[PDB]
From Swiss-Prot, chains A, B:
Keyword Cell membrane: yes
Pfam families linked to this entry: STAS, Sulfate_transp
Catalytic reaction(s) noted: chloride(in) = chloride(out); iodide(out) = iodide(in); hydrogencarbonate(in) + chloride(out) = hydrogencarbonate(out) + chloride(in); iodide(in) + hydrogencarbonate(out) = iodide(out) + hydrogencarbonate(in)
An annotated Gene Ontology molecular function: chloride:bicarbonate antiporter activity
Membrane topology recorded in Swiss-Prot or TrEMBL: Multi-pass membrane protein
Family to which the UniProt record says this protein belongs: Belongs to the SLC26A/SulP transporter (TC 2.A.53) family.
UniProt cross-references to InterPro entries, sorted A to Z: S04_transporter_CS, SLC26A/SulP_dom, SLC26A/SulP_fam, STAS_dom, STAS_dom_sf
Annotated signal peptide: none
Subunit: Interacts with IQGAP1. This interaction enhances the chloride-bicarbonate exchange activity of SLC26A4.
Protein's name according to its UniProt entry: Pendrin
Length: 665, 665
């Protein structure tokens, strides 16, 4: 209604005297470390419940309908997961059975340590692509060709199918172990803010580039062409050019089958997504298309007659655990860090989505610890890095999922598909498995439709999307992520280095101050010039602050004093022979400052000293308490620059200046 | 005196209606490029006067009194320049002849393009070290030994004295040209803010740690030992151990003569600095100690009898210009970027010190063009990077310097020191030249005494000093600078990601709001809870802003709503069978925000949505004009979240709630 106040002009000291402060808490490092480590059993029970969240949702079960919901979601997600594993095994350059291994053990491990309920841990296209890329870069194909086979002219250096897969599997296991170790280190040290740097446009561009690279790789697999494992800089462009040059050496049957299953899967997925109000349970198009592909490929001998590319390499059994070949961490530390951070980011995103959809809370450090333990347990069983795919996750959420029991049942399907089932998947073409991956790329290919929206929105974030998407295409995929985080941090620094300063003026008959470049009927005080500077002054925006002051006052405090001294020597010689007109004061509305960066408080003191020589006072308006306490420690309040120069509000400074002008002409 | 106002509670819309805004300026890209490139004669005269600042101080000269002070300082700095110029050549692994070339040619170029008056362009101890650091790594000593000389058992692979320097001289010329091009790029593209990242603790710790590497490198010449040109990681640590292991192979003639001039040059310099009130002109101790060193070394045959290390390699002549060996810019691009930025940082640092004392403004972007053409012109005559030493600069200013005429006269002394003079410096020991460099290291060795001062001051800046000083010792000197720039920028992100939020309360009978953790007698409104959050919300601190709200209200907006649904299902079944207590509203005092980072502004709409379900209003207090216009573009003002939720001041949000509850119970 009515906003009326009546108080004296407390600038800095008229308010600090009669206001008793609170005594700061003593450090007492001994008592701090003693009180932190609790001795009562309450803290022990709390940390046990937090570290192992399985003991929370188990006692409060609702078996009656939860049993049926979990068993149906488990069989469905198990089918989907074994299909996605046998499909993504090609993205990691590992055999097909190791994908099923990586789709089984992580599920068992993410049961006594996970803190989620609607997450299906397993393979992931982007993570498997990164694993395969680093495996190809660390163990390429031109390092295994053994000369044997009595060739025509030279030594018969044919393909090394065999012991090469063992080396690739050992390398993938070492990479997974290193990723798990990095995740456990990030979880135990309670460092979780490191993944907050992955903004929405950054991860969007990263996923778009990863989807492009996955499309290129799966197109190489479908066409049944052999490239030269180009890796490094412009690897995707080079391999795409090599594919375009090797179009003649394709397989017509494999290409036709792949295109047909792509069209079928895309049409079925679009029909199920659009007309959702008629069929709530998503039709498992992957399962039926894989069954019909295995049925058609088994009838006619596509391997012999049509020379198709089938798997025919399923051993259908387990294997004893193999110790990882430790010693390759120095040359893969950055790759493992990138894989771990992207896996944790995707996992946290999916968890937060399916938690705010079902109204429950998911911890971050617990998810980090759970995924670290899962990757460590997977490294001991010849598996690659595990994550949660959004397509596989939606299955248990749509079909009905309450706890992780549906996830444990999803491993029973993989369990029976490892020991007994799998012989029927022998004549399955690799082009069919390479198609469902492309069909799942529709969710990430449509992410490019946000650039026009982000451009109308904050433009600095729209550039981060395009920068991350392009930079993660030229120089690899893992190196492109590091180039995005640094670019995002540089963009943040540039937004606090080049602020939006204004010409704050006074609204008539009130005390509210608005910018002069946005409103017209604003009257500024006679002689006084007000200035606001956001983005607190640090070592980078000191020259920017100087230029802002020089532009808002019209002149320079240095050149005016130089001209005054040049005109003063003409006065001291005349006795022997015989600019700063409008600016009366400068009220700096430094209300949007947080830190001071003492290198900047030196410049502030220099400004106050320079303007004092030209008879121009530099007052402050909205200096915070934590900022004044910092400036006082940095040696700013000398015998001449007292606290009376600072004020509490913007109108207090103007009122004090008007009263001083009225009382002193 | 009296601060009294009487205005209605204009929140956001009661102020926006009757306040007509100013129309934004039209882009008009066709006219923007036309109005920028002016055609009048004033634009042509302005670009020539700024690019060539010689046409300013030359017409208004004071030959009557200025020429007398420049001829005495020119011959004074010429003797100091010809000694420091040839002494710094040892740090660049180039012969002593090319050291005088770097003190004559850069002066001629820094006469028509320079924008300063008290700067003596020439070599520099830190800059020459970075130049010689890459010469040892690109052309090491074990890459030129030629087997010849009928050795004892194996081929006589003795030293390559002779054509070995030709590979080092041509390498320094290519490095000099690449540094000059980068400086012209920064000057041509008008990008000068890149050197603002070199903060005072960053450049302070870099020059301090560089003084250690100069001390270790010059100690090798004093002791006259032969190391193994260790470069890379821990280069200074490895070469220091090798010196201690080779103490037995020292030279008592070079050590005693080297340690003697260390004490003499340090004592006279310290005595002259303290007792300045008796002798205004600094005594050239560096000059008198070199002449007496050559006289003693010429009398007794120190080369033959005492086996001392002398130069005896001064041809005393010029050379035709040699074209730079283009093709080495790819492997020296990362090294030249670190040298081109320190050659400009020290130039502006030393320039501005002697500019505020003589009261003349030095152009910023012109120094990039000035030293740019200087290094380019120096590359065509077999020189290294040119800079301005603080020790050599203080000579021309203390003895009397007005313009660059004293610098040109200083080049005449170096001019005669090449054609005629120079034969007398033949028996000069290398330990004497390697000692005057160590004596000047006192200015940088005493910079360690600021770490205790910076610790009592802003502690984040004291860590950057120690980080830069240590990191520039482990991994080289040029790589340590880049590790400091990224660490300094990272500290700015850490200060804006972890802000200093408070519990702002109300002062009785007034309208000023202060933090509750600093003052005691502060009354908060009944039910209303105020929160202030500096360091504007971006993608990194968006999660910390959630934890900040959860801590100031006591509860969580998510878990409380989850318990409400857990308690609501018991209500919908009872009809079939038969927390948020204190927090009334939330006033976010977002007055210290500058940008939005729409990635983070989506959570602001989520926070209002999360608190609206629990019947808690989330109001805003001090949102700026440039931020509210950004919220509308990012899709924040929907049909439910209107502008009435925002307020102009903090007390308007409290006054609105007190009247709303009074009128609506
Ligand atoms: Cl997916
Ligand atoms: Cl010096």
């Amino acid at each position: 209604c009515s906003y009326t106040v009546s108080r004296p002009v407390y600038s800095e000291l008229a308010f600090q005297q009669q206001r008793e402060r609170r005594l700061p808490e003593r450090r007492t490092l001994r008592d701090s470390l003693a009180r932190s480590c609790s001795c009562s059993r309450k803290r022990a029970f709390g940390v046990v419940k937090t570290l192992l969240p399985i003991l929370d949702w188990l006692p409060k079960y609702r078996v009656k309908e939860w049993l049926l919901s979990d068993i149906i979601s488990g069989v469905s997600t198990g089918l989907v997961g074994t299909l996605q594993g046998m499909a993504y095994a090609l993205l990691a350059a590992v055999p097909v059975q190791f994908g099923l291994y990586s789709a089984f053990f992580p599920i068992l491990t993410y049961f006594v340590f996970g803190t989620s309920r609607h997450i299906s841990v397993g393979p992931f296209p982007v993570v498997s692509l990164m694993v395969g890329s680093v495996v190809l870069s660390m163990a390429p194909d031109d390092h295994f060709l053994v000369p044997s086979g009595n060739g025509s002219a030279l030594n018969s250096t044919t393909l090394d199918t065999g012991t090469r897969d063992a080396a690739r599997v050992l390398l993938a296991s070492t990479l997974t172990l290193l990723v798990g170790i990095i995740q456990l280190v990030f979880g135990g040290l309670q460092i979780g803010f490191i993944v907050r740097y992955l903004a929405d446009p950054l991860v969007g561009g990263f996923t778009t580039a990863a989807a492009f690279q996955v499309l290129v790789s799966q197109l190489k697999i479908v066409l049944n062409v052999s490239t030269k494992n180009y890796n490094g800089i412009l690897s995707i462009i080079y391999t795409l050019i090599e594919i375009f040059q090797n179009i003649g050496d394709t397989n017509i049957a494999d290409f036709i089958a792949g295109l047909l299953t792509i069209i079928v899967c895309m049409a079925v997925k679009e029909l199920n997504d659009r007309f959702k109000h008629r069929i709530p349970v998503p039709i498992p198009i992957e399962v039926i298309v894989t069954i019909i592909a295995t049925a058609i490929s088994y009838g006619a001998n596509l391997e012999k007659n049509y020379n198709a590319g089938i798997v025919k390499s399923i051993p259908s059994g387990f294997l004893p655990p193999v110790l990882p070949s430790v010693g390759l961490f120095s040359d893969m530390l950055a790759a493992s860090f990138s894989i771990a951070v992207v896996a944790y980011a995707i996992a946290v995103s999916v968890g937060k989505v399916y938690a705010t959809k079902h109204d429950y809370v998911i911890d971050g450090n617990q998810e980090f610890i759970a995924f670290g333990i899962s990757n460590v347990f997977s490294g001991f069983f010849s598996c690659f890095v595990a994550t949660t795919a959004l397509s596989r996750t939606a299955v248990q959420e749509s079909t009905g999922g309450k706890t992780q029991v549906a996830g444990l049942i999803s491993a029973v399907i993989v369990m029976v598909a490892i020991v007994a089932l799998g012989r029927l998947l022998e004549p399955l073409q690799k082009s069919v498995l390479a198609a469902v991956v492309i069909a799942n790329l529709k969710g990430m290919f449509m992410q490019v439709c946000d650039v026009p929206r982000l451009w109308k929105q904050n433009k600095t974030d729209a550039v981060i999307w395009v920068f991350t998407c392009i930079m993660s295409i030229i120089l690899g995929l893992d190196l492109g992520l590091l180039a995005g985080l640094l670019f995002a941090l540089l963009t943040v620094v540039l937004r606090v280095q080049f602020p939006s300063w204004n010409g704050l003026g006074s609204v008539p008959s009130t005390d509210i101050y608005k910018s002069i470049t946005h409103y017209k009927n604003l009257e500024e005080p006679e002689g006084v010039k007000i200035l606001r500077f956001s983005s607190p002054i640090f070592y980078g925006n000191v020259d920017g602050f100087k230029k802002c002051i020089n532009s808002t006052v019209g002149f320079d405090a240095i050149r005016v004093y130089n001209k005054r001294l040049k005109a003063l020597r003409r006065i001291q010689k005349l006795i022997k022979k015989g600019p700063k007109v409008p600016i009366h004061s400068l009220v700096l509305d430094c209300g949007a400052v947080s830190f001071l960066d003492v290198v900047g408080v030196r410049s502030l003191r220099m400004i106050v000293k320079e303007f004092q020589r030209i008879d121009v006072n530099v007052y402050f308006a909205l200096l915070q308490d934590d900022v004044l306490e910092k400036m006082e420690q940095c040696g700013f309040f000398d015998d001449n620059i007292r606290k009376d120069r600072f004020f509490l509000t913007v109108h207090d400074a103007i009122l004090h200046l008007q009263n001083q002008v009225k009382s002193r002409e």
